[PDB]
Amino acid sequence: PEFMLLPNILLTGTPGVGKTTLGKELASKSGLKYINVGDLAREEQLYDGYDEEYDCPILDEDRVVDELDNQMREGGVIVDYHGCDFFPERWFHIVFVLRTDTNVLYERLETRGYNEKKLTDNIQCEIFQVLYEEATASYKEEIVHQLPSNKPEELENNVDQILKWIEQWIKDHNS
Ligand SMILES: Nc1ncnc2c1ncn2[C@@H]1O[C@H](COP(=O)(O)OP(=O)(O)O)[C@@H](O)[C@H]1O
Prior knowledge:
The protein has a five-stranded parallel β-sheet with strand order 2-5-1-6-7, sandwiched between helices. The chain has a two-stranded antiparallel sheet with strand order 3-4. It has seven helices and seven strands, in the order βαβαββαββαααβα. Strand 3 (47-51) and strand 4 form a beta hairpin. By secondary structure, the protein is of the alpha/beta class. The two termini are 15 Å apart. Helix 1 (19-30) packs across helix 7. It has helices at 19-30, 37-44, 61-74, 102-111, 116-127, 130-138, 152-172, and strands spanning 9-12, 33-36, 47-51, 56-59, 77-80, 94-99, 144-148. ATP binds at residues 16, 18-21, 112, 151. This is Adenylate kinase isoenzyme 6.
């Protein structure tokens, strides 16, 4: 991949929709680097404060941006997070909001062992389309796309679609 301009891709959407599954498959099949923002914050200890209601450390957004910026500038990164308003807009060439039917999503999150309050907050996040609205508010409409993420066939279609998009973008930006 030396001396090829490569795109950056954001995968966002409610926890449980399938971002990590899709991102890891995309990385394996494209050679792009996959970054799980939650995992990165854990590894590099990028937290500031604790949230009383949700019972979780608060992500230090400025430090996450600082941690990633050099790599993002170099391109070829697939970023996975359930938030997107704090990323520099320039980072991403395309943004995918994964969507899961509420009934399907509930079953996924219930199996994670989420308690009632956490289940309800996450499920309302999806049914209010919070991440979709956050994405459209943060990035140009023409680069934001919703992807269905309910069934294995849809995962396969998503992988296929995005891999094809990567190939075209590379062709267009390495004349
Ligand atoms: N398109 C899909 N069809 C069926 N199951 C899926 C799909 N995408 C993800 N899953 C499953 O749903 C669960 C949550 O996926 P995960 O990638 O951890 O979501 P996220 O990273 O958005 O929190 C996992 O058990 C995964 O195997």
